[PDB]
Structures are given as structure tokens and as C-alpha cells.
Design a protein around this nucleic acid. Structure first.
Lengths: 118, 154
RNA sequence: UUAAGUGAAUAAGGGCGCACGGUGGAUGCCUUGGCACUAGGAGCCGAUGAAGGACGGGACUAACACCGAUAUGCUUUGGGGAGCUGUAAGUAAGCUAUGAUCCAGAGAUUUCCGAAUGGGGGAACCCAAUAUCUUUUAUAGGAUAUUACUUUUCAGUGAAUACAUAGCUGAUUAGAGGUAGACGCAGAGAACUGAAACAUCUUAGUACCUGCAGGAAGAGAAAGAAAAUUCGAUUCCCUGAGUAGCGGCGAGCGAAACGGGAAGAGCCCAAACCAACAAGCUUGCUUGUUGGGGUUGUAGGACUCCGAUAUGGUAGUCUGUUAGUAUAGUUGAAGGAUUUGGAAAAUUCCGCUAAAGAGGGUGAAAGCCCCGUAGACGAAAUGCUGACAACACCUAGGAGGAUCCUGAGUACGGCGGAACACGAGAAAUUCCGUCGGAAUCCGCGGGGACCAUCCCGCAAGGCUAAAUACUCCCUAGUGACCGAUAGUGAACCAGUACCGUGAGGGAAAGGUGAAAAGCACCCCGGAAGGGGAGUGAAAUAGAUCCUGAAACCGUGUGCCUACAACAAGUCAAAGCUCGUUAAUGAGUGAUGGCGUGCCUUUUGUAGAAUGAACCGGCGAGUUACGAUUGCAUGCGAGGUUAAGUCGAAGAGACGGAGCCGCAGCGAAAGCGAGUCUGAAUAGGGCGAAUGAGUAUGUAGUCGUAGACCCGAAACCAUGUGAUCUACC
RNA sequence: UAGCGGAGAAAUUCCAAACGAACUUGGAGAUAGCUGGUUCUCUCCGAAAUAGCUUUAGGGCUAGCCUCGGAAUUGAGAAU
RNA sequence: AUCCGGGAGUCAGACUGCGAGUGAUAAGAUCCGUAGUCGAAAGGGAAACAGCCCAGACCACCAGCUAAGGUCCCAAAAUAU
RNA sequence: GUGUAGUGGUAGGAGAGCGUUCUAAGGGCGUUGAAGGUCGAUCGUGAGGACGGCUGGAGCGCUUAGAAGUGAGAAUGCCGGUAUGAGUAGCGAAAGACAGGUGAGAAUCCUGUCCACCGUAUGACUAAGGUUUCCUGGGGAAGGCUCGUCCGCCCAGGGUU
RNA sequence: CUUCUAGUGAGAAAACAACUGCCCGUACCGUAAACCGACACAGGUAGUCGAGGAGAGUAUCCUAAGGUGAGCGAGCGAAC
RNA sequence: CAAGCGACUGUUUAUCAAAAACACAGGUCUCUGCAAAAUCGUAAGAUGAAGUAUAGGGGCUGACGCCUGCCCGGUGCUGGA
RNA sequence: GGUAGCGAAAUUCCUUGUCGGGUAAGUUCCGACCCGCACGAAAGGCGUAACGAUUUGGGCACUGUCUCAACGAGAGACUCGGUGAAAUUUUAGUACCUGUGAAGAUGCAGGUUACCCGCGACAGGACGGAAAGACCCCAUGGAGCUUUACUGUAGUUUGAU
RNA sequence: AGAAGGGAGCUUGACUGCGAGACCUACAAGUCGAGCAGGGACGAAAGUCGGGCUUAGUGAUCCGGUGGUUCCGCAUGGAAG
């Protein structure tokens, strides 16, 4: 009835290790510090998975800033007129257009200029 | 702890060495120390109400008859205990699987040929228990053993 | 050509991934030893010198075993039928079918110390006396036997003191030490701990010391238990019962009878009397010793008078005769071929045996190869247990009640302590120390202070098998027990190595392969070590020898790194090299965003509060007995067995003593669907009006127990130390 | 000469490197309202640091606050 | 919400609006009443920050709207009228 | 199906599950390679589970129920191995030099010469105490605070009237 | 050991010659590398002998008989 | 050259103190008639001692010189009846 | 109800009392005074030759103690060959300022300085290392000691028997 | 101040058994009470009276004492208790 502890532990530990391939020193061959490192990495992964969605808005916004301002439309008045002429493009598509299809972006800027002109 | 052939002299002082405090060489943490809450000799046996025993035996036998597994033989006899005939007795009776044999009383010449392949196992009519029926598939029993069973079981 | 601007690449060394070795022995598998028990035997050894030891014995001898100057062995009686001289290689010497070695039963020899026993002593040493016999011409030298102490019997001798008493001498009887770390009976007898402190109490008459034994001990044949209607030695178990009781009425301690079972069993003295011998011969008949007679409560015996001189018994023998059994043994059934292998017991065909298919071994896993098992047979010798012989021992009726006997400084009282569940309490019963001190059958003790009636018994003398407790040891077995950090401390040459003056404390260390076939020969090297060639299925199985993880130490290389302040990451991402369990692929990473480890304790943590050097292994809420609630199951106004017997250590039925519910109120007499309080039919407290339990499994919690683990400073009881130091 | 003690031209000095009471074995796994630790996972709900009394104040009991299972009427809860 | 029953932890609190005490109408002081948050709460703002302002994460997405607070550059948005 | 609704959480209460050893029955795998080890870019909400490649060479899985010495990262834990400090501190008072031997190998052994140190002692004899360290011939694996052909070390023989 | 008596109690002295004399210790170190201190350790160890020149002297300085050159070194010539 | 303490030679905390501490010769009180008091031991037995008041134990002071006042109400001791 | 004697003392708080001597300058020393917080006659008062590894004040001689340092020798340190430890240690690619914070930061915030790797020196910091505070409180914790604290007892004595 | 304050006559309700229902509160406790029965006081009656204008004047249990009692009493009748 004596239950020995044969190989119930190494499975677990070496499963932890492999999850820590490539850490900047002795944090990949110490079964005590690899675990703490994995824990903090989990925290960071979770937090930043909620930031990946923040940035790209600020990025598309700066790009709409740069491109639009060249047409005499501040980065506000463009969005305002657009949401007034009932045009509802998504920022990501607006950033992509501003970078690539300059003709189309200028068409939209013209419509918006017309819109809040009323 | 108190049974290991150890001692009660401390390892060293309580202080000084800055080390942790220890009371005895023999103790649970040290290698070669006593165990805490290890297995002791016990009993494991216990009985039931007197009625449920009878309900159990009745239920087992009714179950086995419920699927045509009691094969009632008239009477078995062998002058000498020749093992080979028994095999032929079952071959005629077409019982090949794991089986159980119930005999009446000391007509031993019919048991002394039941050290076969363990497909068979022998028992008189006073020791029929629960397992020695539930563990098997078919059951052989002479005609007198049936009545004898129907006596002890009231 | 000038000028302005942009600007790649190289690594003294480092990072990441990958790939290959080295140290180290986790893990997988394995057993040569353990642990807990079952059934049976056996429960002492010693002045005829014990337990335990020192020294010796072999061709070689360091150790372990066995043995003892007859020394690795002597004699005899049975077994057995071919190799043999231990561990352990090797060589030399031999032995053996004229039956070795080996197994089993009987004998013979047994050095020295040790209660140690002639005296002495620092144990395994020294020195004696007296007789007998030896060597040398003799002195010295050698061997043999005896010589301690105490008491129990007997002689002699004996004398302060005559007679005889110490005393002495000689002979004779018995003791004296050990332990089985167990069980029993006594003498003497603690503290920590609980009471949340502590004085009476408890822990506890336990631990320890000492004496005395036995295979068992202790108790045992009523001055008993009871309370009508009785029963008739003692021990042990179930239930009575956590009741009646005791208790700073606190923490706590805690019975007994009745009832059901196991095993059964009763005997022998003192006295009164009767004889023979001896003494004072009071010659009164007193003393004594023998032998006879007699053993009790329904009072018996003596004593008188008659019958018989039988009839039933054993708890004795070491006396025979038989039967059985314990210690060596004998016999014991059935297979070939094919495919993989180095090897088959594996696989596929086709057969056989079983009162034998339990197990162990053989080149992997065997009913049919080997040892065995189921059966059947067997003892020259020795021991035990029966049985029946023979011998030993013991035991008779009826009737009478004139006189005699029926356990003395005892019972019991005061005083002071202990033992009974009972702590002096209203304290019976039982002991111990001191003082006081009964009656004699018309008599005495007891029925929980004490008295009266009644009832039951006869103390102050002994013995007594079985049912019960234990296991150092031997035999045969078993296990939802361990598998080298486990299991004994110890699987191996272990209470050893080592530490301490001493009592005392105490480890680490198993694994080549099937078989050593354990690497001839060459080559470098002083050697060690290595490279070929070989043995081998496998040498990365080569003696550090099965598998061979992690920390730690190295070699090679794909990607990056010398203007950079980094809890060391994650999200975003150019380039460079790849190409997987084939899928929204893998490695690295220039550059940007964001970001103060883990655990515990705290109002609050990154804390400059506190713990971790790193890797591996071990390491903490369990079990028995009670109590209560939920779940479930079998019967339901019922439920239900216990101890114990037969049974395989099981199942598997008997066994109705006992417990729980079905009726409550009252302190109690008692009353009863009611009752208590009260002058009360008043009112009020409590229960009824349908209202379900009980046995077992299981789980949660609680109680007694060390009770989740580790952790003191201290306390009590036997021992060991003055070789350092203090005084002499 | 010995630990309930010994020895001290006196210091709490010495008694086998440590003496306001030696060392070693046993009662003994002594006791600790105190400190440290206690190992696999997910779903559901989820507090308190208050009153009273205590030779009590960092402890404890009951009460309040939390959770789980049942019974019954509700209209009893709540905020306007 | 009440009732019956099984199982606990808790008895060292802290700061901040408000109204009072002792203090010197001093203290991140101490001791009570009352509300929130922290303890047992992560995300945004206050440069960094338990207890202040806003708001309660089952999970995924390179979608959309707002609160507190902000809009020259670090750093998303008006060099607004 | 489809709608509505909820899903932070310490002490703590409740519920459902993963994994290890062993027992029982049924059914299975294994020299045509089991357990164990290593690597892999795979699967489920979790604990966790499969599959393949190499090593390894004798036993182990799967289903249903049962019993537990059943799960480890912290106790200034206990046992073994290995790191950092680091090629750092130290090498335990006192004077040596040359020539020639010896030898695979020399400051460290032998021989020679000069020098130098103690000399009421660093000289001679004894009592304790140690227990073969004594002598002769071989050796260099370990001890010798380095070296070592040498030794109070290892091997063999022999000495105490 | 020397004497004197009480005393059992052939005839012993000394010639010379020739013989008998038991057990245990004896190596080695021994102000040390062999003992006591864990060590091949700047400590401790009772007794005897212990020389010459000066010199009271076993003091001091150099030396006789006699013994030793000590178990890591080679360089440089800074701080401290 | 002067002062304090202690008369002196000694002894003392092995291992943080060597003195002004203790010892010390002298002073004084007190006990004890011998089986002495006193001490070790339950007792036998011992030491005091093979001693006998010029002796033996106990308490305070500490060579030497000059000295050493008052109180017996309280607490002990001795005597009392 | 403190006599003789001493008296800012090994005793005096106010206190460095007041006056004198010693020094250029003296709270320490020595002499004298009495308002002795709180000297006193065997827990002895007051003088004292000699003695003291005793405590305190002042002279002479002498000098690296000092103004104020300088130089020389030897051992260590430093370089090369041989041998070769220890306490400590969560992982570390380990800058400065003013803030902020459990109220003093290498690691947070905002700024400033800064190529990579070593070698010899110093000791500001890492609340540096070694000893689970010796100071203080608590534990309804110990142990050793005192007494007209409680309860008992060895021992000494008294009476009855 | 229609008195609870102050005089005056008679008296003892400064009574026994109780109690629907409330207040308080962790417990143990404490506070109020209409009213029923018995038997009364003062008043012609109606009626009031179970202490004082209301709120303090007190102490578990264990143990001992005194009175009473149709309770129990270890074979039975007493008694001790």
C-alpha cells in the first residue's frame, strides 16, 4: 500500500520547463525560477491582450491625422462631417485608404467638406 | 517514533550553531525516522441483519434459474475416481464455460474428479455461499442436492 | 577633382536554439533479508562446573564458520549409492563400490577464565599443602587425586566452671550464579501533566529498584450470596452500565449481585477418646512419643447398643504389555514437429495425462524437461501420548442423647494509619502498629451506623487439575504487508568501523552476461591509460561493470551583440536561416509600447519586515471505542442480537440473557391520557388529540486516547565520573 | 572525598574545554492560549475586525454577520 | 422576510465628506455616531500612489459610443468660436 | 430549439472531476520489443491524455467495483551530489652553493667539498606512555601542506637469550 | 639479622672434586615526526650526566665531544 | 617631594577584574566536666582525641600606640515561680 | 536625645562652597574654615615607621609620544612554476539627482551623465556578514535567594501509656 | 396646588394561592400587570389598599443552622440520615 513517488513529478516539472524555452539566463534550467517567470508572463500576456486593441486605434488615428490635414480638414472636422453626411467607414479602413488609395481618400474628404458646409 | 531503536539525546544545543532546532535523531523528517499515521493491524470484517442474507441467497438462485442455468442431473456415480469420465459427463451435458458443482453428501467419488481445469469447482450442499454461485455461469447439481438446499433455506 | 549628405561588413569575448560527450546515481524492473500473525512442540540451565568468552586446530591461515591437546575431528546404530578434502580461486598431496564425503539417532574426548570453590588477583595470570607415581647418583623438574563458605544430621574432643555448654575436628545433606528486554505474587514507591493558577484530588499504586517462583502463577471447598419461591467451591467472557455511588459535589474516579456461556472436582489435619514405650515411676496418675480413632450446621463426633466386615474409588508407580506419534526417508502419471530467435516454455498443427493444473528452476512465459505436489509405503535407536495389566494407597449402616470435644492474647473495643467505586462521612465489610481484653451449642458470626423479631452460615489449621496471560526458541504455513533514503540499526564478515576515560552514543555500503567464455597477439606509453585484433546476440554489458534523469563542466555551429541604464518579460516587428504530428508553420532578433520577483505575517508590501545557494529523494487531520445528523438499504407497532459451538483464519446456520421504541407527570409516596402545585371543579407548568421506529453501510462533526507535524528553558528515578581541577 | 552532594586563605570558584546546581539512560512523542509549515483541479455562494461576561484584554462562550438541507403560511421582506 | 436543523471564520481594523469629545477647535494623534472605499477590487484620471474622482474582468476579435479627465511636442485628440 | 437573466473575490460552506500503488472478475498487449529515459510544430475548459523517431531488454496496460504509507516550492526542514567566492587566502618561526652519481623523469634521494646553527642543550642514559614504528631487500596507487627514485607509508623476510 | 632458653630430637665441620638453580620484562622513540593536544602542531612531560676561554656562576658571547641546515620556490626591491 | 587605602610575607574569579577583596598574628563575647559540646550517618560506627578548660567548637574585629560615651522602653537569650 | 575625635571626606545634592599655596592660566591636588542634605567609637574612632606589578598631584633626567615628518633592513603584499580552502548566495545586462512610497530607493516617476573587458589600491552604500536582542513588555513561563506571605516537615523538647 | 404637600379619627393590604399579556435581553437575571379564589381593613355608599411621588439601600451555586412536613427509609418494625 506504500505508494512511491516514481514519475508523477517530472512529467509536471518538465512540462513547465518546455513552456520556458529561451529565457535570459538561468530562468530556463531552474525548476523554481522558471515557474515564477511563467506566471508573470501569463499576467503580462493577459493584460496586453487588452492593449493590442487599444494601440491600433491610436495608430490609425495618427495616420488619418497626417493624410487628412493635407486636405485642409482637421482630424476632428473630417470625422464630424462624415458622421454628419451619414458615412460610416471604420477607422481601420480609413487608415488603409489614406495610405494607399489617395484618390478615394480625397473623394471622401470632398464629400465631407461638402457635408458640414451646409 | 517511540518504537524505533533511537535515542532521546538531542543532536546539539538549542542555539549557537544558528541551525534549526531538533529534538531527536529519530523523528519524522529525518531519513530513517518513524512514520506518522502508518497502517496498524485491524479487522475489516462485519455482519448484516439476518434477513438480508436469506434474501440474497434467494435472489441469486432465482436469478440463475431465470436464464435456464441450473442443470439438474439425476445422479452421479463413479466406482473409482477417474477424472476423464467427468469431462465426458459435461461433454454430454454440453457445459463448457465456467461452472459450479453442488453435491449432496459424502459421495466423494464424484468430487475426487473435480480437480479439473479450474472451469469446475466442487462444493457440498452445506457451504453454498453467495460468491461461489455469483462468480460462475452454469451450475450442476444432483436431484437430492436440490431438495437439501430447499431444506436449509427453509 | 572638390563639396554636402548617407553609410554596409568583420567579435578580444558574450547571449539563444540545436547536436554530442563527462561527472552523479534518480527512476523502471529484480531479491540473497525483514514485518505482523495462524496451527503444533517446547517452556528452564547450573558444584558431574552453567550463560558468555580467551587461546588454539588445516599444506598454505588474515577473517567467518565447526572443532578442542583424541582439536577442519573418534565409536556405534539406521538412511543413501558416486563423487569427495567449508567458506574461496590454486597448486601439492591423497580418500572412495571392502560403500567415502553427506543425512538422522545414540555415545567418547572437551585447554584456560568465569558463582569459581586450595591461597592471591589488574578475568582468560601467579603461588601453594598433603598422599601416590615418575626423570637424574641426588638436589631441583613432571603428572594424578584431595583441600573454600554456610546448614542438616552424626561422632569425637572439649572447657572461664563440676557436671556440661560455648569452640574445635572429622564425616554427611542442601544452597550459592544465569535469563525470555515476555507473562505472575509481594516489599518499597516519584514529577512534569489536568483542574486553563494551586495546597485535599488526579497523572498512579503506573515508571524505576529489590525479593520469590511456575510453565503457568494468584483464588478455591461458604461465619457466602439472597430476601420467596430460593442457590450451594474458584477462575474467565457477554450484559447489568457509564447505572447506584464517591468527589475543593469541582476536573474527574466507577462498581456488585441477578441472567446468558467456557471448564468442572473435591480432600487432608488439631482436639476430645483407645492402646505400647519412656520419664516424675506421688507407687495420684502427670508428662512425652509412637500407632489407632475424626473432620461438621439438617449441628457433627466422641461415648453406649446392635449389624456388615462389604461395596465403590483415585489427583500414585517412573512396573510391565501393547497402539499412535516426533526426530533420516522410499515411490510417484503424460510431447512431437513447424516460424522467429543466440537461446523457446513463444506462435501454428496434431496428440496425451490428471485423487497429481500449489509452487520453484532450466539460455524469454512449460499440466506432459528437472525438483515436486495427489496418493501409497517406511525406523535399528531415542522421546512423548494413550489404553490394560500388576502393585500401591482411600472409602461402610442403623438407634440413644447423661457426660465430654469442635482451632486464645484469637474475636472484638479505643487510638493512628492503609484496603474496599466509598477522600470519616450517619460508615458496615477487610488489613497493619500500639494499648485493653470475650462466650463454649440455653453457643457464636453476618444481612452497610444501632436495637428487636426473622433468615442464612460455623472464623482464629492445611492441599487442590480445567476453562485464563505470555513467546527468547523449533517445525510447517499465510498476508488487497516493505522492496535498498523503504523493511530490524544491520539483505554485504554490524552492535562492526568510528566518537567518549566511563556508563553510553552508531553509520555508509545489494544488481556484468545465459555461461568468465573476465580481452591470446601486435602498437604508443616508465607505469597508469589507450588503439587495433579477438570472445561474445549486445563491450556506449570491460569489472567505478542492467537502465542511466537533474544541478554542474565542456566541444561545434544557424541567428544577434562594442552610444548603451534591462524584476529581464509580453504586445508590436525588418531582416537572416530553415522545412513540421501539414497548420492562419519553426528558430533568432535590429527597433518601439507597457511593466517595481515568490512565500508567510499584517490596517498596509517591491519593501530597507521574514525564509529559500542550486538539483534530486523522504517529509503533516490517521485508527480503535463511544455520541449525534444527512444519504441509502431490510423489516415496521416492531427492530434486533451478544458471549459461545460446529465450520478453511471464510459464511453460516444455531444462540432471545440483553438494548432501543410503543406513555406521561411528580423530588417522593403514587396517579394514569393524565398529572403536579393549590382550600379549590379556579387558573398556570408539562404531555395527548395520526404524528414510526430500529439494524447495518456510508459521510460531515464532536469525546477519550501523543490525535495535524516540528520546536524548549525545566521536573522526578536508577546509574557513570576526582587520570583536569579543589582539599587531604 | 559524589550531585537532595562534595571541596572552597570565599570569587557563585571548581568537580573531564560549557555548573545560581555535572554527565548518561528511562517516565517521554512531557507541556507550550506562542512561532514556522501543511502537497491536484474546476463550478456556486461568500463574510468579520461588533455587544455582553471572563485572575480577561494578542485567548474563550453565546449573541450578531456567512453557508447547506427541509416546513409552512404568505403577503409577513424592501423603496417610494 | 420568519422557523427547525447540519458546518464555520471572525473579537489587532485604516483613511476619507460630515458633528462632537480630550489635545493648543495642533498631529498621517486618540475615542465615539453616520456613509463610502480598502481589507476580499483588478481597468481609467490624480507625473509615480490601497483608503481621493470614474467604474465592478466568464472568454475571443487589428469593430462602434461615452464617464472622470483632456485637446502645441514627449503623448490621442481644437494652435477651436 | 428559442428568449430572459447572471458569471471579481481572502477566512469559510457546498458540488462535480484529474492522477499514483494495490485487490477482484472480464477482456488484452509483449524478443516481429513492456516498463523506464529523450525529442517532437498534437488533443480537451482544468487537473491531464494520445501518436511517431532514437535508446533500452522483461513484464505492463483497458473496463466495472473496492482499500489507501495517494499528489510538495518554502518548516534558519533531514540525506546525497554539485556549484559561487577563486585559481583567491594560505603552504605552520631558523642559510645554503657547486661537482659527480643514480634514474623514463631531479632544487627536494646518495656521495664529496666548503659554509652555517645549538651546545645546562637542538648532546648521552633512563621512568612512564605508545605498541612492531626496529633491521634487510623490493615498490610509488593513496598519506607527505609542492616535488619525490625517498619515508615513521605499501609488499616480503627477520630480529627482543 | 644477632643472641637465650623451652625444646623434637645417630654424627655434623671440613677438606676438595664434580654438578643443580623456576616464571615475567629486555627491539625502537622517549624536551618528540613514534607520548598528551583531531595534525608530521611555535604549547605540556618526573629523574641522572651536563666540557673550554674569560667569568661568583648551570648568567652572557664564541666554541669541544656530538647533532642539525626544519618538507614549497624563483624573481622584483611600489602603496600599505 | 606630598596625600588616600591597606599593617606586613601570602591568597583570589582555569578563559575580560589581582584590589582598597579573603586570609593573617593580636582583641572580645559565648558554649562545653568527658559517652563533653559539634558534625557525617536511620543505626551500629566514626571524626573532635588516643585530646580533658592554659583544652575544644561557634560569632564579630583585624600588627602597633591613645582609646572604646548614652539608652534595656521594643526584639532575642538567661533566670524566676 | 551623638561625648572624645574627625569634618565639602572612598561619605557634601546646592557645589567649580570661601580663603591660602602651587601654574603665564588649576572644577584635580595640598593647607585652613564650619551652615555634617545624610561622620562616630570592635558592621570599631583617630595617629602611624616599614611594605605595595595599589589609586592620585608635582619636580629632575630622558626621549619621534608631539610641532612635522624623512630615510634604511627583513616578512607579507606584487610577477612566474607547483598545490589549493572558508563564511556568504531569490534570479540579476547592478549609474546620478529631486521626488514618491510602510513616512531615508541600484530596480518606481521626471530629468542628467555614460563605448566593451580587465588589473592594483581605499571602505561611503548594499538598512553589509557572523550570534531567531543580552535593553523593555508579555507567557495566568522557569530556576536560584529572602522573610513577622500560606501550607507542611526533618530536628530539639514536654506529657500519658 | 382637582394635589403625591400639611393636619386629624379608625386601623395593619408592610395579606395567602395566583396570573392573560407585555418591556428588557446572548445567558442567568430585572420591571409592569387588568383580573380569579380565600379572608379582611377604612367608608353611608361609590370604592381604594399586595408598602413609602417615581428611579439606588445589594451577592449564583456548594456547605452549615433553626421551624414544619399525608415524602423516603437496603430481610421486616423502629431509628440514624
Amino acid at each position: 500500500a506504500r505508494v512511491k513517488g516514481g514519475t508523477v513529478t517530472r512529467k509536471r516539472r518538465k512540462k513547465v520547463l518546455k513552456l520556458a524555452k529561451g529565457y535570459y539566463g538561468s530562468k530556463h534550467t531552474l525548476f523554481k525560477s522558471a515557474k515564477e517567470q511563467v506566471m508573470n508572463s501569463y499576467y503580462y500576456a493577459f493584460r496586453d491582450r487588452r492593449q493590442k486593441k487599444r494601440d491600433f486605434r491610436k495608430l490609425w488615428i495618427a495616420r488619418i491625422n497626417a493624410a487628412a490635414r493635407m486636405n485642409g480638414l482637421s482630424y476632428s472636422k473630417l470625422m464630424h462631417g462624415l458622421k454628419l453626411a451619414e458615412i460610416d467607414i471604420n477607422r481601420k479602413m480609413l487608415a488603409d485608404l489614406a495610405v494607399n488609395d489617395a484618390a478615394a481618400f480625397t473623394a471622401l474628404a470632398e464629400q465631407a467638406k461638402d457635408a458640414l458646409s451646409k | 517514533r517511540s518504537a524505533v531503536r533511537g535515542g532521546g539525546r538531542k543532536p546539539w544545543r538549542q542555539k549557537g550553531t544558528g541551525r534549526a532546532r531538533q529534538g531527536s535523531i529519530r523523528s519524522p523528517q529525518w531519513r530513517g525516522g518513524g512514520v506518522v499515521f502508518g497502517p496498524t493491524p485491524r479487522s475489516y470484517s462485519y455482519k448484516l441483519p439476518k434477513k438480508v442474507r436469506r434474501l440474497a441467497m434467494k435472489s441469486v438462485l432465482s436469478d440463475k434459474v431465470a436464464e435456464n442455468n441450473l442443470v439438474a442431473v439425476e445422479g452421479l456415480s463413479f466406482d473409482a475416481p477417474k477424472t476423464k469420465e467427468f469431462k465426458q459427463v459435461l461433454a454430454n451435458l454440453s457445459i463448457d464455460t465456467k461452472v459450479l458443482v453442488v453435491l449432496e453428501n459424502g459421495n466423494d467419488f464424484a468430487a475426487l474428479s473435480a480437480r479439473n481445469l479450474p472451469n469446475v469447482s466442487v462444493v457440498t450442499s452445506d457451504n453454498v455461499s453467495v460468491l461461489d454461485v455469483v462468480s460462475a455461469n452454469k451450475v450442476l447439481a444432483t436431484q437430492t442436492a436440490l431438495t437439501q438446499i430447499e431444506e436449509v433455506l427453509a
